[PDB]
Amino acid sequence: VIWGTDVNVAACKENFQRFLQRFIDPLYMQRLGEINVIGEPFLNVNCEHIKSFDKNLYRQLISYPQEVIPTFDMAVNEIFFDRYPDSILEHQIQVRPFNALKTKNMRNLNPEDIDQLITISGMVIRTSQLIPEMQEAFFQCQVCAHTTRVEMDRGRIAEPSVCGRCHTTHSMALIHNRSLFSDKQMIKLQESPEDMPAGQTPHTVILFAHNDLVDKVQPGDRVNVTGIYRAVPIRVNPRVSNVKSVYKTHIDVIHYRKT
């Protein structure tokens, strides 16, 4: 297993692929055919189906959503390469599980759920325009025009500070359009009000739809969102690498359930 997890790549894949084929209300194969017809490369799944089929896999899913989901896609794509083995798709199928652990007491959420999937009912309040976030930054020396690229430099970008051809001083400046970007939509959502017992201070959270699943919820819509709880440091200053001991937290959405 990968370190720190009870997760085997092959065994979990076969268990998931078994769940896709073998199931009782087999619908996953039917919507796969619908996906093969339509071409929509996503497979939204009620996680409680996996719980009923395999509580351990469901438990394994909740513990390691980020680790386990790529295996789930791998299992589904091979199934798509089995049934309708030849086809055309701009990208292969994906999976967006949901409705797993109704920890709808958003005002009661602990750091124990960090990096574990959770589903919550609430009303989106505010949104924003899609943020094109760099993933590979094209660069080129000012002096001799020596082009180059830096690819996924851990969020920040590493300034070359020296050319590659002439090897002059800091001359490799980023090229915006030539660089590679991905869409990222920020959303702020409030706790569902009727679910709050006291409601003395309604709880609010942030969301991030990355590269896809963007603008699918307009403001004010009461939906059940399922995604990966996340916490990240905050630099005390952008200039300095020091960070706070506290950790601002957000959700990277995996699935939206309109309601």
Partner: peptide
């Protein structure tokens, strides 16, 4: 609706 970062350039 179809515009994306992929369509830059």
């Amino acid at each position: 609706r179809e515009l994306t970062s992929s369509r830059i350039g």
